[PDB]
């Protein structure tokens, strides 16, 4: 594949800032925990930097294209992605196989500001049948993985709300929450080259006291 994973020390500022983004963007979900489990915080077990020259150059090439189409503004974010295919993504990159075909903004690749939103997809859409070992969507034992990804949004189409093409004249879609005042935005891209899987985070959800 060309992918190397470099472990970050918990003493490293980079580990600490990624962990803080993970922990601080947990929220409660309208499903009461059905899909992703019941928790307020995680036990972070490992954070690895994902290093792949080809995939990075694929990303920066597309980033430049988007920037040049948007007054030299890539509108780059760091966003979470959860998927049963995390280990394929880090080796091969994002592509049409990683799209949410039934997503509310069409068939594209979905990312979240709330880590807990991406956690709902670690075992599949709706949490699937939960962890493979115990069949438990709220498993507190099994190790989960999320990606913290560098994403190029460019000019993003704003959708107020409660693989396809991006809307004409746009590079992405932003799903803005219109009902749940505590929810953060979600984003969709329609080209795998617009995201790079920068950090692989291994964690457990923690049972509340
Ligand atoms: N196509 S598939 O076979 O890879 C199944 C799949 C479906 C949905 C996701 C997914 N949906 C989201 C929706 C909103 C916000 C964040 C996410 C996210 O991180 N992942 C991941 C994988
Ligand atoms: Zn389990």
Swiss-Prot record:
PARP catalytic domain location is: 9-209
Locate the residues binding Zn(2+): 131, 134, 139, 142
PTM characteristics:
Ubiquitinated at 'Lys-48' and 'Lys-63' by RNF146 when auto-poly-ADP-ribosylated; this leads to degradation. Deubiquitinated by USP25; leading to stabilization.
- Localized where? Cytoplasm; Golgi apparatus membrane; Nucleus; Chromosome, Telomere
Tissue localization of expression is: Highly expressed in placenta, skeletal muscle, liver, brain, kidney, heart, thymus, spinal cord, lung, peripheral blood leukocytes, pancreas, lymph nodes, spleen, prostate, testis, ovary, small intestine, colon, mammary gland, breast and breast carcinoma, and in common-type meningioma. Highly expressed in fetal liver, heart and brain.
Instruction: Give the family per the record.
Output: Belongs to the ARTD/PARP family.
Q: Assembly state and interactors?
A: Oligomerizes and associates with TNKS. Interacts with the cytoplasmic domain of LNPEP/Otase in SLC2A4/GLUT4-vesicles. Binds to the N-terminus of Grb14 and TRF1 with its ankyrin repeat region. Interacts with HIF1AN. Interacts with RNF146; this interaction leads to ubiquitination and proteasomal degradation. Interacts with NUMA1.
| Protein purpose | Poly-ADP-ribosyltransferase involved in various processes such as Wnt signaling pathway, telomere length and vesicle trafficking. Acts as an activator of the Wnt signaling pathway by mediating poly-ADP-ribosylation of AXIN1 and AXIN2, 2 key components of the beta-catenin destruction complex: poly-ADP-ribosylated target proteins are recognized by RNF146, which mediates their ubiquitination and subsequent degradation. Also mediates poly-ADP-ribosylation of BLZF1 and CASC3, followed by recruitment of RNF146 and subsequent ubiquitination.
Q: What is this protein called?
A: Poly [ADP-ribose] polymerase tankyrase-2
Q: What is the taxonomic lineage of the source species?
A: Eukaryota, Metazoa, Chordata, Craniata, Vertebrata
The gene from which this protein is expressed is: TNKS2
